[PDB]
Amino acid sequence: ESDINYLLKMALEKIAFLPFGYLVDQWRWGVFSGRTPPSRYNFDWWYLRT
Amino acid sequence: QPLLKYFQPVTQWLQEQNQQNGEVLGWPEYQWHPPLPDNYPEGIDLVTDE
Ligand SMILES: *[C@@H]1O[C@H](CO)[C@@H](O[C@@H]2O[C@H](CO)[C@@H](O)[C@H](O)[C@H]2NC(C)=O)[C@H](O)[C@H]1NC(C)=O
Numbered sequence: 001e002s003d004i005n006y007l008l009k010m011a012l013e014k015i016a017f018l019p020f021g022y023l024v025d026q027w028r029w030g031v032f033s034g035r036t037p038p039s040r041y042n043f044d045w046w047y048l049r050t
Numbered sequence: 051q052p053l054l055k056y057f058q059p060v061t062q063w064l065q066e067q068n069q070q071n072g073e074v075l076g077w078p079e080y081q082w083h084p085p086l087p088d089n090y091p092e093g094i095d096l097v098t099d100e
Pocket residue numbers: 078079
């Protein structure tokens with residue numbers, strides 16, 4: 001029981017972050033390459049977030 | 051380029067008309083969705099033509 005408590009404590013910061021890190025650079029790659037023009041910054045951002 | 055050259059007169063007229071009407075090109079507010087018509091499932095056979 002203590003091990004599950006500790007593992008859920010750890011997974012709230014080491015697993016909830018994995019979508020974020022990939023999302024951040026993926027968006028910036030799209031912006032740099034030209035696939036996200038300045039008229040689609042928020043559209044693509046929130047598409048990646050969801 | 052040939053496609054844009056072919057449609058040059060219509061696109062010039064459209065640009066002039068949009069600038070005169072003061073429209074914003076593109077669709078900001080990408081989240082907007084039209085509201086459901088009142089009593090939609092059962093009020094479909096009503097004439098609303100001008
Ligand atoms: C984007 O949405 C924002 C927030 O809803 C809009 O700002 C509001 O615009 C309405 C309509 O003019 C105003 O009544 C509100 O007072 C505005 N709120 C604020 C905090 O400024 C904004 O106009 C929208 N932008 C575009 C380009 O559609």
